[PDB]
């Protein structure tokens, strides 16, 4: 439970994002460049984190008989002195691949900003994480940047798209832990998966798609409103409309159909999933720039991206129980 | 494409079902009895079929630290002289476990009748299958009876229920075929999965839940109507209302939320899925006897079960291309 002091206590976003805003179609050199950038960001700025790749290959509707590689990026930090197989993971996810067609599509909100948002937020809590663990409970932080979320084919095809998340959920679901472990599979050790998608455009609308995580959705909404009351949001004023259009809906009145995305493989295998995607609550339509050459840096609203970063930081900090550890200011001390 | 002669050409259902209508909670001796019955049915009546078990264990909300076993039953027949890894499988599924609470629940429509319906239909096409293959294309027939579909816990819990189908979809998704094979995984070799659930009650209402299989739903509806026109349905007259309430909906107007069941793990991993479940189209409510001691043999409508068996037989026969092979009558010949 975070205090207003904790919130006031909360590599600029533009610096972290710039290197992501290039074509990164899976299997191409753009993908390798963006991937090594992300890994090097964690290796230099978050050295306490372990980084890892998960690799698969599969044919797609446009690759004929060639097998395209799909490389998920995983990075995590666990409380020290704990068997990693006893750790529950808060898991933050976005996809780092880009749509192939049209040639040179960038995917600024889809989903480079979401990736930057995650990198920024975990960077901002790392020091408080160290502070709270130095003091000491069986919960860690994890990010997954998925590859191959985007579909390649013209037709609608059940096995097209979500290549990275299907491969990752599959292999983690059969990564069987010791029988002495608190958790039964690597997949089952995910306590909450938060997928960010289509973020960075103005005035997003975020619905609540999974009853089993509506409480977390409401916690997220509560934090947004508190940061709005504190005057800490740059894209909205103290009287702005809340992004979270289901914040008052009762868990038993939720009836929106989920949007097919990276959370579906994990959810269908039994993971609690929270899908933070900007889509009209009534029509289901995505932002106007979606899958258009206009989803570029010049249509990003960076005040909204900064707000998203601040909110995700606050959410992760509340969830990992960092209250009283966000401020490390020391008076009369050098 | 089936002719009216083919349809007229189409171990009574009660004989196949009787042994299934006992408690069969996973891990208990009822489960082992029902499972060995099903396997022996295939071994004796369908000797051309290979049978196989897929085994996992997992804790549940009511087993404390004990791991409950979950045993899926799989049976299949492939065209001869074909590498099994080049075969696409039409796959018919129902769950053979029963709800634990209340004690002694039977699950007549949930889902013993669906299981009997599948066993009856594949029995009825086996001879035509032999006939069409003797004449000779890369498509086989497969049944899965899943265990642990039912949830055990009081609360709603993302990883409770669907134990068998989650385990089976997971392991088949990583069962990687030779690179020379037409299909890339055992999971990916499923061409169409048809899940039958909550069948055997009067006047079912079947909605279309997946656009990517709406065509198959419409083929199924078409067969129903033709069999109604032929006077071949025992539960409905030539003017009865069609069970398939979405038969005229355009693929682009489908907007019903899927019901969480055994198809979700397979669908989320990229399998085309057709969910034949009786639920009110407007409210989502299941049959009245659902999860009540009234879901027993005495509330089954066996004319409806016979109709379902006939319709599933017709669907599988149309799908496997058995036209002209359903009638083996020979005039002036002993």
């Amino acid at each position: 439970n975070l205090s207003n002091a904790d919130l006031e206590a909360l590599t600029n976003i533009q610096t972290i994002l710039a290197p992501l805003l290039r074509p990164r179609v899976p299997g191409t050199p753009g993908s390798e460049l963006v991937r090594n950038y992300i890994i090097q960001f964690f290796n230099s700025a978050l050295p306490l984190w372990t980084t890892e790749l998960q690799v698969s290959s599969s044919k797609t509707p446009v690759s004929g008989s060639q097998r395209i590689p799909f490389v998920n990026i995983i990075a995590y930090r666990s409380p020290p002195g704990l068997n990693e197989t006893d750790v529950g993971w808060l898991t933050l996810v976005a996809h780092y691949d880009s749509l192939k067609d049209p040639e040179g599509f960038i995917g600024a909100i889809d989903s480079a900003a979401p990736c930057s948002i995650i990198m920024s937020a975990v960077r901002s809590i790392d020091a408080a994480l160290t502070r709270k663990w130095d003091n000491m409970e069986q919960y860690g932080i994890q990010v997954i940047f998925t590859d191959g979320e985007e579909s390649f084919g013209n037709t609608l095809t059940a096995n097209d798209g979500l290549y990275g998340s299907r491969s990752l959920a599959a292999h983690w679901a059969v990564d069987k832990y010791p029988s002495t472990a608190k958790y039964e599979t690597r997949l089952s050790s995910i306590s909450l998966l938060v997928l960010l998608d289509l973020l960075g455009a103005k005035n997003p609308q975020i619905a609540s798609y999974y009853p089993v995580t509506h409480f977390d959705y409401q916690r997220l909404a509560a934090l947004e409103s508190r940061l709005r009351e504190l005057g800490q949001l740059k894209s909205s004023g103290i009287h702005g409309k809340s992004w979270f259009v289901d914040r008052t809906t009762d868990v038993r009145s939720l009836k929106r159909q989920p949007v097919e995305d990276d959370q579906v493989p994990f959810s269908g295998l039994g993971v609690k999933v929270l899908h933070v995607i900007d889509a009209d609550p009534t029509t289901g339509e995505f932002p106007s720039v979606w899958h258009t050459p206009d989803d570029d840096e010049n249509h990003l609203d960076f005040d909204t991206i900064r707000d998203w970063s601040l909110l995700i930081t606050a959410f992760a900090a509340e969830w990992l129980g960092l209250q009283g550890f966000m401020d490390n200011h020391h008076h009369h001390h050098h």
Side-chain angles (χ1 to χ4, degrees), chain A residues 1-251 253-334:
Chain A
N1 168 26
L2 290 190
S3 84
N4 283 353
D6 292 313
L7 294 177
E8 280 168 3
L10 312 178
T11 355
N12 103 285
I13 194 82
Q14 188 118 25
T15 297
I16 299 172
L17 175 66
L20 307 170
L21 290 166
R22 42 155 61 97
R24 40 197 199 285
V25 177
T28 71
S31 166
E32 171 109 11
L33 300 188
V34 161
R35 166 163 67 257
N36 284 123
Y37 165 61
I38 291 173
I39 292 155
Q40 206 55 217
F41 175 89
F42 277 85
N43 283 341
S44 56
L46 298 167
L48 288 174
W49 291 49
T50 308
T51 47
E52 144 177 31
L53 308 183
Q54 190 267 336
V55 190
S56 73
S57 75
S58 162
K59 298 182 235 128
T60 84
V62 312
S63 81
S65 78
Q66 175 185 8
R67 263 161 227 261
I68 304 306
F70 298 106
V71 189
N72 300 306
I73 304 168
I74 303 122
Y76 59 91
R77 208 193 150 180
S78 177
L82 257 205
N83 305 12
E84 302 213 311
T85 54
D86 299 330
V87 176
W89 303 93
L90 168 70
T91 306
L92 310 181
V93 184
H95 80 87
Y96 79 90
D97 69 293
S98 52
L99 207 49
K100 177 153 162 301
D101 173 355
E103 243 275 12
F105 183 80
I106 292 290
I109 73 164
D110 193 14
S111 268
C115 293
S116 81
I117 284 159
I118 291 168
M119 303 161 77
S120 168
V122 296
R123 192 196 225 301
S124 311
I125 73 178
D126 192 69
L129 262 175
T130 313
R131 227 127 50 210
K132 148 158 201 274
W133 290 343
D134 270 340
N135 168 205
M136 284 323 197
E137 101 172 301
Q138 326 91 290
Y139 292 108
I141 182 80
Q142 182 161 238
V143 309
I144 304 172
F145 304 95
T146 56
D147 197 11
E149 183 280 335
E150 289 286 9
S151 277
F152 293 97
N154 351 64
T155 178
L156 168 68
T157 280
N159 71 340
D160 185 19
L162 317 184
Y163 294 95
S165 51
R166 291 177 158 143
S167 183
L168 188 53
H171 289 92
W172 285 16
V174 302
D175 175 6
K176 217 294 162 193
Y177 280 11
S179 82
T180 166
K182 156 142 162 93
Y183 293 100
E184 278 189 274
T185 65
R186 190 170 190 188
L187 190 66
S188 78
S189 75
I190 303 178
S191 302
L192 171 64
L193 193 159
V194 186
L195 170 63
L196 308 192
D197 201 355
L198 310 184
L199 311 181
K202 281 206 261 313
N203 294 309
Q205 306 180 90
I206 314 291
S208 180
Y209 294 100
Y210 294 83
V212 66
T213 62
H214 193 45
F215 181 64
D216 302 274
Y217 175 95
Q218 287 176 312
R219 294 186 118 191
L220 182 60
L223 287 165
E224 187 222 24
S225 57
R226 289 175 66 188
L227 294 165
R228 165 184 329 279
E229 265 277 335
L230 277 156
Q232 267 204 254
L233 299 185
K234 299 135 292 296
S235 75
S236 296
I238 189 137
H239 306 306
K241 159 166 256 166
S242 170
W243 296 341
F244 298 91
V245 304
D246 282 325
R247 51 181 310 139
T248 75
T249 317
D250 189 73
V251 61
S253 314
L254 284 178
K255 296 187 280 280
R256 20 233 347 166
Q257 165 147 214
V259 172
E260 184 134 22
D261 192 5
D262 279 332
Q263 89 277 10
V264 176
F266 295 89
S267 185
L269 293 189
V271 178
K272 294 181 43 190
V273 134
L274 176 64
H275 192 187
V276 186
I277 183 162
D278 182 10
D280 182 287
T282 79
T283 174
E285 294 297 328
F286 294 151
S288 60
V289 301
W290 182 79
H291 290 202
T292 78
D294 282 357
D295 186 13
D296 57 35
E297 195 176 357
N298 302 319
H299 292 69
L300 290 183
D301 189 79
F302 281 83
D303 281 341
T304 302
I305 293 174
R306 289 185 257 272
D307 279 354
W308 269 120
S309 175
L310 180 73
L311 182 60
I312 302 318
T313 310
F315 182 86
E318 152 154 27
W319 195 98
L320 294 159
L322 303 188
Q323 53 273 1
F325 290 97
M326 311 308 302
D327 188 2
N328 210 25
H329 289 191
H330 300 313
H331 112 125
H332 287 57
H333 171 92
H334 181 185

